[PDB]
Design a protein around this nucleic acid. Structure first.
Ligand code: K
Ligand code: MG
Ligand code: MG
Ligand code: MG
Ligand code: MG
Ligand code: MG
Ligand code: MG
Ligand code: MG
Ligand code: MG
Ligand code: MG
Ligand code: MG
Ligand code: MG
Ligand code: MG
Ligand code: MG
Ligand code: MG
Ligand code: MG
Ligand code: MG
Ligand code: MG
Ligand code: MG
Ligand code: MG
Ligand code: MG
Ligand code: MG
Ligand code: MG
Ligand code: MG
Ligand code: MG
Ligand code: MG
Ligand code: MG
Ligand code: MG
Ligand code: MG
Ligand code: MG
Ligand code: MG
Ligand code: MG
Ligand code: MG
Ligand code: MG
Ligand code: MG
Ligand code: MG
Ligand code: MG
Ligand code: MG
Ligand code: MG
Ligand code: MG
Lengths: 258, 184, 185
RNA sequence: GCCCGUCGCUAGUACCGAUUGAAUGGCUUAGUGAGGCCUCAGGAUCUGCGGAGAAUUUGGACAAACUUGGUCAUUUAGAGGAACUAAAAGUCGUAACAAGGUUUCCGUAGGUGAACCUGCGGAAGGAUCAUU
RNA sequence: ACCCACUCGGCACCUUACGAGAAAUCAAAGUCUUUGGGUUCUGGGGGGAGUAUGGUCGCAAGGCUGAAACUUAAAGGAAUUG
RNA sequence: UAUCUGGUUGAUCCUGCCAGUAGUCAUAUGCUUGUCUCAAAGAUUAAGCCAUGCAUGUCUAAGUAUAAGCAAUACAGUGAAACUGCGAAUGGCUCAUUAAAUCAGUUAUCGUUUAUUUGAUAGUUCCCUACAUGGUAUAACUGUGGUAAUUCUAGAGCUAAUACAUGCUUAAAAUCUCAGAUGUAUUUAUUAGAUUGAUGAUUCAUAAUAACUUUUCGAAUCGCAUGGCCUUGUGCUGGCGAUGGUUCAUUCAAAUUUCUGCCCUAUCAACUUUCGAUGGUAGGAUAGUGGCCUACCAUGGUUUCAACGGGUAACGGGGAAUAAGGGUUCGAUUCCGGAGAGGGAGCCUGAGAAACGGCUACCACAUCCAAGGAAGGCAGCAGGCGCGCAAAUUACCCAAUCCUAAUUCAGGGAGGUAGUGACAAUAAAUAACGAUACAUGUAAUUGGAAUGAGUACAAUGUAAAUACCUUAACGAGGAACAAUUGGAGGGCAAGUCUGGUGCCAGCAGCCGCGGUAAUUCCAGCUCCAAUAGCGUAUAUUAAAGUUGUUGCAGUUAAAAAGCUCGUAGUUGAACUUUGGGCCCGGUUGCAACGGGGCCUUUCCUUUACUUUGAAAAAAUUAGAGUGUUCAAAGCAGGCGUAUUGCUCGAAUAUAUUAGCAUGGAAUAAUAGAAUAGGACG
RNA sequence: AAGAAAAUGUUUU
RNA sequence: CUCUUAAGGUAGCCAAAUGCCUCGUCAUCUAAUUAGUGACGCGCAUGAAUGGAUUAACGAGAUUCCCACUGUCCCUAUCUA
């Protein structure tokens, strides 16, 4: 209505953020940025609600303006910067890195990682196109454009991004039997292996995924993120590895600690 | 102002639509350029997104392509002889896309002579090479004897401010000559 | 504006306002359990009806259904934890067969009587209200407390509240202050 | 016993109603038409044969607004008229309920203080399930 | 033409009602709380009222369509005893 | 949470409504009102009118500082003013319009624009400055003024830029034209983009050619550190950034867009079409598609499967109340979408507005005035008037939530805090226990205890408070620190008690009660019901199988059309692979049940329907866990300690319309070869 | 075979 | 119930070209109306082929209002034969 909205009412924020209902009338609206509004995690939320380093937004800004936080290797002093899937958030003080991956329940889990693999990050190839002057380029899920990609890289593949030079180091192909993260839908946060890809020309492509426990679910091609091969994920998986325990076995796991 | 909305312009059943949402800027129209001939005057229109259109009023010269030799020489527009959409545009010499104009033909004469040199209508041996391809349509070469080449406007002068076009050739040329002989 | 705050009713009034047998049974319950008004009985009946409805909706599903199993065992777990349900009869069809007195017994006001902390149910209610009873390290002045079957062994007088504590009270202090002169000095 | 209508008393509610009644809004015919916008120009005076150019101005399209006529929707005043309803104990008769004292009722038509009466056809919901 | 037997179709009738129904009664008014063969029309307490209004048909009488305000605790069906 | 009861009668069984009964985050009102938690609140009528005050401004190290401002060899800090930039298009409010419109779900952009963010990206420019151009420039400021008055401005004198306007340097390599041309941007034409990238698909991406531009970009910008080499000179190189910049991609978006779905009405049956209605061609216009508009043409387009018209005391949805099932009703209002800012219209700026705390005009209101003129828009926050049955402070604050800006700092009536507040919801004081006297109870026979309602040191809580939580002291005896609101014929719990009145007064939802022995009025006493609440009115839901699809009734209670025809609609006989067998194989405990495959003459059009899957925001609903002291709630929290901390969670189900994908092929429909114009090879 | 006239009754128990 | 001489003005209609009183009363039309129209009706003295009521069309008939129009007027002036 007359221009872009700048506010985000609470109860209109993404549910994954696990924001308190009766805290205020508003939630941090993710600024324009690499990933998305709904699919992102604002740095204020990651710093105050997931890690409890800052007590409020003022302390979040105090953290960010003294150049502690760093997203994908860059300082990113923006409080509502939309850090999203597979972004690397390194804090030099309290020296540690996190990889923004989805837990089994679909929330952006706090996933502590070491520097030797925080060096890079993975990116799903959103599109492959010819740029100006006939230069090919790859657009990844995080809005990155990388020129002169390997001529064998197609859409729905994954590329390992150096994150120091922003170049392609390795690339995984979307194919049957490759490890996939689910980055949307009901099965968000689940990890499995591709069983089949149904084409549906003009429609949406479907893909069948078998997790390690042999549970098979079908989801749209839009929200499957290749992360490697069976047993060999190119990233450090979170505590649950995308197993999707039912509520009964979850209760059994909880009550196994007595 | 002018609206391109469809909230007016009653529904396909014939029902008169009630009004809501008083005219919005993003559905505006503007007035036609009504490009004339001679004494170039180009006005800048600030369009949506900060872009810019060029209303060409009173355009004198444009770039016209032969498309048989791929030359696209700049020439002066003599006048308008035919308009499929409105004869009044011909009468008022309004420059508009798809308008059939007459161009001076002199730059084309010069290029043809300097390139092939075969007395079209009245480094040495390059014409020896490009002599077999020197024959052109009788209905095209006959226009040079009068110094007026028929052409069709392909740009939108009201949008881009240019009056580019192409020389009529072949079946298109024959069609427009038949219409000209029927209406003249 | 801020998100709305959810609130619910905790009771339900009877359909027939003047059923003589219902009125007599309610007054019997009020006398037996030292209740202030019929609203406490209404609240207990409302909770019991909610529990019975949940049990019926579970029973209408085929046995060994995941939802039936999960929510059922949750319901028995909660009921045996509060003490209303019997350890023996954990099959949810003996949840269907519960009664209001089962919930009225697990009240803190009822338990303060049943443990000898008070000489009447109404004395127990008064003792709870006047900040004399603690459950653990916590004074509880709510007569409807639903002792969790793990606080039953721990219900005792408070460190404050000079009946099981160490203080001299207030009216006793005033009586002693006046008796200092009343004795002659 | 019960009961029907006219006619009297009182109260209330709608309806009709001269006023070429009134008001409001939508749509609409024919007119007038501000204003900004595009455009034909125009050229204070600030300038270095050129440029920027205010007032002013041509023709357009968009059109507020007003007048007139029509239509619809909604509301509303009105001399007066004519019904209906209600209301402890009014007048006239007694039409119906019994074969209600002329069986009742329907349709239709006429008459008539009032219920009603009468003609023609019909029904039994009749006072006849019945005369080999 | 008649008599006997059978049959299809018809106007009906007698008995009993398994059944139905408030009952009177009903071979349908049955096969309806064990509620579904198909389908059309109509009713939603009594009045106001088949009135007002608009429409339409009619020469007219009128017909078809058709309210509301307001009013009211009954009106009504079948049967029982007087 | 599958329930009824009173009222037609002398009695009966019905029909049938009236009445009762219960709920309502459902309003209002009466009486009453002690405590804690939570907190709806000028929607309904008047999208009626508004005094006053506030609600939008914004500066970093990093655009412009000579304030004649403050401070201890160009300025160097701070920095009012102003120029520049950005924002002011978000928020907040309201529900007036609006009925295929909005909206919801689902689509599309191979039909477009997109400030910003993020990522990538620019050796090509010249026909006597680059060790850096101009005022074509001015604000602030100084000084001189006009007006009664406005956030009015004139004249005069300076001065800058990331304002405005100009304008070079980057060779090298490199192909065409006959020395020049070749970056990018625009426009046209042409070529390739194959069977040398992408798509289901393109005139796609992209490239190439020839040209074309009232010139687009290709930093004359800023901060901080200074380094290396060195002919140590006005040397050559060189760091981290800020800001700006073309194109592309991305993000925030926007605009159009597919399919299906809206309440009542026929006392609306034809509508649209001259003045665009439906389509075609061309053009114009637009950011772009499109009758969006124009010209010519064709006569189309919608409709009983309800068009069109009319009403709506209609914004749509998420949802709410009630609900055995099926439903009925509500949804101005916390979130989403739309629309509006007194009514219209027009427009500037800007990426984005047809903006209204922007402008212009008319209309209606309406304000100052010195009469010349000038100025307006509370459906933002308070507040006032009015309207009404019907709704609160002209309070405090940016501390939290977030937003904006040049931005850690400023601003924010957004928002939060408190005030008012029996909207609604949670919890639950008004007593408990002994001794005397009599028959577990009894009463003005008495005692020791207990404590909060308040009051208040303090502390905490808070942005500062208030209050809650915690507590020094005080603070019960008819504990007067005194609970009410409705009732006592029936429905319906509770009086054949007393006085009063005497068909009066009055009660009574309904039936009824009152006519001098009133269980019904007015009272006293006593009792009943609910109880910090209770009553009344209205609306609505259940009851209502009194709207009936489930599931009503139509002989006589209301209702079968006088009768038949007949189009739409609804419905419509049976029949086409059935049945043997051999296997493999999952689930329950060899049996049962499911599934898949082979033969058996067989092998693996169009629909409806049904399965399954993805989908249908959150909040709300069900629901798991979790001692907010319990609870409503909330999404918290839990674990042993003298740590330089470990850890579980914020699940799960549901919307069965429409669309998508998928298995089945019973049921129901549809089509085949008949003048063979048939099938197969 | 058949057999003239006959109107009315206040309101609440 | 009567009596004057039979009946006793029904349906309609009206201060009507029929109403004295009368410029009736009420409404409307106007600034103002003995006018007009619509009502009312114990109507001096309305009323049924001495026809009553109403009526589309028609009228050099009588009447009121409105729009247009104008020297009818305000207020006269001028020209031609
Ligand atoms: K009486
Ligand atoms: Mg939108
Ligand atoms: Mg009689
Ligand atoms: Mg008789
Ligand atoms: Mg008689
Ligand atoms: Mg009858
Ligand atoms: Mg009725
Ligand atoms: Mg009878
Ligand atoms: Mg009722
Ligand atoms: Mg207190
Ligand atoms: Mg209002
Ligand atoms: Mg907004
Ligand atoms: Mg292209
Ligand atoms: Mg076109
Ligand atoms: Mg609604
Ligand atoms: Mg409305
Ligand atoms: Mg709403
Ligand atoms: Mg409203
Ligand atoms: Mg909203
Ligand atoms: Mg707006
Ligand atoms: Mg207003
Ligand atoms: Mg506006
Ligand atoms: Mg305002
Ligand atoms: Mg605004
Ligand atoms: Mg008290
Ligand atoms: Mg009494
Ligand atoms: Mg009783
Ligand atoms: Mg019925
Ligand atoms: Mg009947
Ligand atoms: Mg019949
Ligand atoms: Mg048919
Ligand atoms: Mg069949
Ligand atoms: Mg009698
Ligand atoms: Mg008469
Ligand atoms: Mg008269
Ligand atoms: Mg008259
Ligand atoms: Mg006159
Ligand atoms: Mg006669
Ligand atoms: Mg006469
Ligand atoms: Mg004549």
């Amino acid at each position: 209505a007359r221009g872009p909205k700048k506010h985000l009412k609470r109860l209109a924020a993404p549910h994954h953020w696990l924001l308190d209902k009766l805290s205020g009338c508003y939630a941090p609206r993710p600024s324009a940025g690499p990933h998305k509004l709904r699919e992102s995690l604002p740095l204020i939320v990651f710093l105050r609600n997931r890690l409890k380093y800052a007590l409020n937004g003022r302390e979040v800004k105090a953290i960010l303006m003294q150049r502690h936080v760093k997203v994908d290797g860059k300082v990113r002093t923006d409080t509502t910067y939309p850090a999203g899937f597979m972004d690397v958030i390194t804090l030099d003080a309290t020296n540690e890195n996190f990889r923004l991956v989805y837990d089994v329940k679909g929330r952006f889990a706090v996933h502590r990682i070491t520097d030797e693999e925080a060096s890079y990050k993975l990116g799903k190839v959103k599109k492959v196109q010819l740029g100006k002057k006939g230069v090919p380029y790859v657009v990844t899920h995080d809005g990155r454009t990388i020129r002169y990609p390997d001529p064998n890289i197609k859409v729905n593949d994954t590329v390992k991004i150096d994150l120091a030079s922003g170049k392609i180091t390795d690339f995984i192909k979307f194919d049957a039997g490759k490890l996939v993260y689910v980055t949307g839908g009901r099965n968000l946060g689940r990890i499995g292996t591709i069983v089949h890809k149904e084409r549906h020309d003009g429609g949406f492509d479907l893909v069948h995924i078998k997790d390690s426990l042999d549970n098979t679910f079908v989801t749209r091609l839009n929200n499957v993120f290749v992360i490697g091969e069976q047993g060999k994920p190119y990233i450090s998986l979170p505590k649950g590895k995308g197993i999707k325990l039912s509520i009964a076995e979850e209760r059994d796991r909880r009550r196994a600690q007595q | 102002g002018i609206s391109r909305d469809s909230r007016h312009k009653r529904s396909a059943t014939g029902a008169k639509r009630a009004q809501f949402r008083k005219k919005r800027k993003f559905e505006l129209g503007r007035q036609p350029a009504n490009t004339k001939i001679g004494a170039k005057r180009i006005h800048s229109v600030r369009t949506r997104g900060g872009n810019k259109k060029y209303r060409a009023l009173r355009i004198e010269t444009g770039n016209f392509s032969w498309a048989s030799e791929g030359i696209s020489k700049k020439t002066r527009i003599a006048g308008v002889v035919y308009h499929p959409s409105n004869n009044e545009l011909v009468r008022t010499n309004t420059l508009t896309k798809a308008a059939i104009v007459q161009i001076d033909a002199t730059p084309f004469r010069q290029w043809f002579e300097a390139h092939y040199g075969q007395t079209l209508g009245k480094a040495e041996r390059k014409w020896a090479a490009r002599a077999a391809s020197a024959k052109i349509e009788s209905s095209v070469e006959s226009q040079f004897s009068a110094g007026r080449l028929y052409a069709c406007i392909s740009s939108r002068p009201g949008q881009s401010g240019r009056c580019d076009g192409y020389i009529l050739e072949g079946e298109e040329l024959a069609f427009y000559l038949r219409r000209l002989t029927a209406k003249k | 504006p801020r998100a709305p705050r959810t609130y619910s009713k905790t009771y339900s009034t009877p359909k027939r306002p003047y059923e003589s047998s219902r009125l007599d049974a309610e007054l019997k319950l009020a006398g037996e359990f030292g209740l202030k008004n019929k609203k406490e009985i209404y609240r207990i009946s409302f909770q019991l009806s909610k529990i019975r409805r949940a049990a019926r909706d579970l029973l209408t599903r085929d046995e060994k259904d995941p939802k039936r199993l999960f929510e059922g065992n949750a319901l028995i777990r909660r009921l045996v934890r509060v003490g209303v349900l019997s350890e023996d009869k954990k099959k949810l069809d003996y949840v269907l067969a519960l009664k209001v007195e089962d919930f009225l017994e697990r009240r803190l006001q009822t338990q303060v009587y049943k443990l000898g902390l008070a000489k009447s149910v109404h004395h127990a209610r008064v003792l709870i209200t006047q900040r004399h009873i603690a459950v653990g390290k916590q004074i509880v002045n709510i007569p409807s407390f639903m002792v969790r079957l793990d606080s039953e062994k721990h219900i005792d007088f408070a460190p404050t509240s000079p009946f099981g504590g160490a203080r001299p009270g207030r009216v006793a202090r005033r009586n002693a202050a006046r008796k200092a002169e009343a004795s002659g000095e």
